């Protein structure tokens with residue numbers, strides 16, 4: 001009967017179209033390179049006021065070289081002119097009543113205890129320690145540098161998909177509405193401008209610059225290079241997204257200590273101890289490109305051939321019911 | 322004959338079970354994301370004694386920002402109050418008998434030779450050089466900071482599988498036996514506590530803190546995120562492993578030089594030159610997640626269908642022999 | 643007819659050979675790990691002359707720890723003995739005629755403007771600013787450190803393919819023609835020596851050390867670990883390639899600012915502001931290993947079986963035409 005091949009032809013038309021669109025949708029004919037090879041060069045610009053001092057890029061950006069992880073210091077605590085010696089720790093956790101509870105068995109991971117119980121102040125009595133004196137008082141409140149909200153982060157990114165040796169940069173003058181020197185990234189108006197406003201990044205990440213600058217934090221500028229290397233070079237394009245990575249028992253925020261080391265004409269040494277709070281920026285470059293390949297195209301082919309060949313049989317069985 | 326289909330049915334039962342368990346074992350129905358996207362924030366805590374000085378996190382940890390690669394300095398060599406000028410190098414490799422073997426052709430990659438053969442000491446005669454004087458004597462023996470064994474490394478890690486957009490952190494309060502503030506990672510008792518004892522990491526890596534602190538070294542804290550994103554969020558879990566990466570013609574260990582730069586009231590410049598030996602820690606985050614996908618499930622399906630269809634034929638041929 | 647099976651046997655011989663060589667060529671029987679896990683330790687050696695000063699590794703290499711991204715400073719601009727205060731900016735872009743165009747609305751991202759229009763010099767009138775005074779004059783010409791061309795970069799690299807747990811290092815004494823201590827990487831004579839001459843790297847990247855040292859730049863030392871883990875351990879070998887990553891509206895080159903902070907006996911603070919130009923080196927380790935697997939071998943098998951089975955039918959149809 002001729003209707004049998006019009007039923008079979010329809011079987012193949014319909015079934016083969018479902019299978020066809022699915023495999024064509026997932027790019028099953030493409031080999032994929034998910035090991036992007038990226039280089040990130042960052043540049044911060046701006047000047048702020050902290051206390052009655054002005055902070056420039058040499059003062060608040062650390063490290064200075066422009067790596068993929070850098071910190072913009074927004075608030076700090078200074079303990080000036082420390083010197084090696086003996087003094088009573090100011091932390092309440094070091095409370096003592098007598099030298100019998102200032103032995104090495106107490107607070108093993110903390111500072112070096114001399115073994116004497118001394119009077120830090122008239123209201124507290126703490127174990128004495130050997131180290132930089134006086135000790136740090138990290139329980140005071142200090143201001144934050146508000147001008148940092150208007151600083152700009154410039155991200156030059158040069159990536160390469162090695163499986164295909166397809167290397168490209170994220171400086172694209174034609175994709176940007178305004179000139180490179182004056183543009184400013186906006187997810188909608190200018191999504192390819194490499195210059196980001198610090199406050200903007202804080203908003204795209206859903207964060208309040210006040211609380212964030214107060215407690216410090218870790219934000220991620222995510223650069224995604226999802227590319228179809230079957231298409232034009234023009235089509236491999238970076239997409240920027242933003243997220244807070246520290247999120248959240250542990251106290252949120254981000255801070256670290258470093259000192260400025262000075263030496264007296266006498267030769268004695270003394271430092272300024274600095275506890276820094278800021279916003280660490282991690283440039284996270286993901287990417288995966290897909291190029292047509294004979295092997296995945298043959299495997300996907302064989303897969304779709306056999307699957308339709310069985311679907312037509314099963315559909316014949318379902319119809320005859 | 323009915324036995325022919327009981328032989329064929331057994332063929333399909335047995336053969337299909339082998340193929341089935343194999344493919345089900347390798348998760349052949351799963352697409353895999355092997356391009357994890359991780360952020361690492363580290364925090365070191367502790368205080369040590371070196372010579373008659375106390376070292377805190379601002380003194381022995383470098384860099385300070387808490388990156389994925391940091392160094393805990395255990396032994397150092399100081400050459401204090403250097404100043405630009407001329408002086409005889411102390412390295413024996415620079416031995417000379419006359420100014421005729423102190424020309425630019427000699428030791429091309431070394432320091433800047435003035436061209437004079439001078440008497441460093443009464444027992445050695447070396448080429449004179451222009452640079453920081455006096456020169457460094459890196460052949461002496463110095464102590465090591467033993468308290469560093471009791472320092473703790475706290476690793477906060479926030480990763481994301483971008484192919485699935487599955488982001489998670491390694492701070493898991495319910496997986497830890499004791500509180501976050503006081504726990505301490507143990508591969509068996511508390512394998513999810515993010516706080517590591519430096520000495521412990523040295524042991525998990527099979528290293529002696531004495532020799533390691535003496536020569537310096539490079540250890541790896543490996544965080545592995547092997548996950549089945551078909552299962553619950555609760556099941557994606559990090560696993561910590563440890564290894565020594567410098568291992569091993571070349572002299573083992575790890576050291577680097579940096580200076581503390583001071584300026585005299587006169588305006589002249591002088592530095593303290595420091596050769597630092599310590600333990601560099603590299604946090605190496607690997608991860609790959611697997612999620613069910615239609616394409617790999619169809620390809621694996623077609624693969625198992627055809628393979629059993631041939632195995633039953635071959636087994637029929639083997640039986641009739 | 644017997645010729646029908648000699649035509650079919652030839653069909654299978656020919657068709658099966660094409661398919662066979664193709665699949666065998668692409669290692670379709672291999673699972674692939676493209677998430678290499680690498681550790682990089684670098685060491686720079688050399689001494690240069692800048693002005694009438696000598697720069698050693700502690701002076702021009704930053705950071706000092708030997709990370710995968712480091713900088714060799716070739717030219718710098720010093721602005722010595724700055725101090726907080728008020729002074730007229732030297733940038734022409736800050737030209738003013740009256741204090742009415744020195745308000746906060748002008749150059750929002752720049753320095754902190756006091757609101758006064760002052761005379762920087764007799765030929766220029768600029769807005770006054772609060773900050774480090776005097777201001778920087780980054781339009782002068784300064785020398786470059788030429789000895790940096792003869793510096794050597796030593797790269798120790800320790801990688802691991804985690805899917806197979808195959809870890810190896812790039813220190814291979816038998817693959818190098820000369821001893822480790824004295825060899826020098828050459829793409830042809832000694833392509834496994836880990837010691838690179840800075841000038842050499844500049845040439846492999848197609849760059850002129852003069853212009854590059856003048857403007858600074860970003861070069862990549864690419865380490866590739868393409869390996870067949872079916873073969874001997876001896877066969878997994880690193881291959882070094884080189885490229886300039888900054889390439890290229892934006893001014894090329896690479897520079898960053900950092901200060902040396904001094905304090906007077908009076909207690910007042912003053913710094914030396916340094917704009918550094920150099921060559922940043924990014925060690926980029928790519929790698930992917932292939933090991934035989936049952937699943938990819940079965941899938942590729944099924945793929946080739948079905949494809950030949952159809953090719954013989956299509957070829958029969960083409961012949962009978």
Ligand SMILES: *[C@@H]1O[C@H](CO)[C@@H](O)[C@H](O)[C@H]1NC(C)=O
Pocket residue numbers: 104105108467468470471
């Ligand atoms: C580490 O701390 C314990 C106390 O918890 C102490 O007994 C031990 O001596 C310390 N280790 C070193 C090397 O000082």
Ligand SMILES: *[C@@H]1O[C@H](CO)[C@@H](O)[C@H](O)[C@H]1NC(C)=O
Pocket residue numbers: 173174234
């Ligand atoms: C950049 O603009 C020019 C025209 O000004 C255009 O020809 C060029 O193709 C653009 N860049 C790309 C990748 O197309």
Ligand SMILES: *[C@@H]1O[C@H](CO)[C@@H](O)[C@H](O)[C@H]1NC(C)=O
Pocket residue numbers: 266268
């Ligand atoms: C050096 O002088 C200062 C006072 O200027 C003094 O406090 C310090 O103890 C002296 N150093 C020594 C080792 O005496």
Ligand SMILES: *[C@@H]1O[C@H](CO)[C@@H](O)[C@H](O)[C@H]1NC(C)=O
Pocket residue numbers: 425426429788789791792
């Ligand atoms: C590099 O060293 C060689 C000696 O090995 C010397 O002749 C040459 O001038 C040096 N290059 C520079 C740029 O100084």
Ligand SMILES: *[C@@H]1O[C@H](CO)[C@@H](O)[C@H](O)[C@H]1NC(C)=O
Pocket residue numbers: 494495555
């Ligand atoms: C953490 O503990 C709470 C109960 O205290 C539990 O409900 C929660 O599910 C735990 N975390 C996870 C991922 O289950």
Ligand SMILES: *[C@@H]1O[C@H](CO)[C@@H](O)[C@H](O)[C@H]1NC(C)=O
Pocket residue numbers: 587589
């Ligand atoms: C500055 O003074 C010191 C002694 O305090 C002296 O050694 C040095 O040479 C002087 N600098 C100059 C340029 O004379």
Ligand SMILES: *[C@@H]1O[C@H](CO)[C@@H](O)[C@H](O)[C@H]1NC(C)=O
Pocket residue numbers: 146147149150746747750
């Ligand atoms: C940012 O700059 C604008 C001028 O462009 C200014 O009005 C605004 O106050 C600045 N923001 C902060 C937080 O100072």
Ligand SMILES: *[C@@H]1O[C@H](CO)[C@@H](O)[C@H](O)[C@H]1NC(C)=O
Pocket residue numbers: 815816876
């Ligand atoms: C290094 O050289 C020795 C012989 O001196 C040789 O036996 C060894 O196999 C070489 N290394 C490798 C990976 O073969």
Ligand SMILES: *[C@@H]1O[C@H](CO)[C@@H](O)[C@H](O)[C@H]1NC(C)=O
Pocket residue numbers: 908910
């Ligand atoms: C400290 O002394 C210097 C001169 O040596 C002077 O210029 C400076 O203004 C003084 N500091 C203060 C707060 O007066």
Ligand SMILES: [Mg+2]
Pocket residue numbers: 091135136137138
């Ligand atoms: Mg404290």
Ligand SMILES: [Mg+2]
Pocket residue numbers: 412456457458459
């Ligand atoms: Mg020496």
Ligand SMILES: [Mg+2]
Pocket residue numbers: 733777778779780
């Ligand atoms: Mg300027």
Ligand code: NA
Pocket residue numbers: 299300302303620621623624941942944945
């Ligand atoms: Na298949």
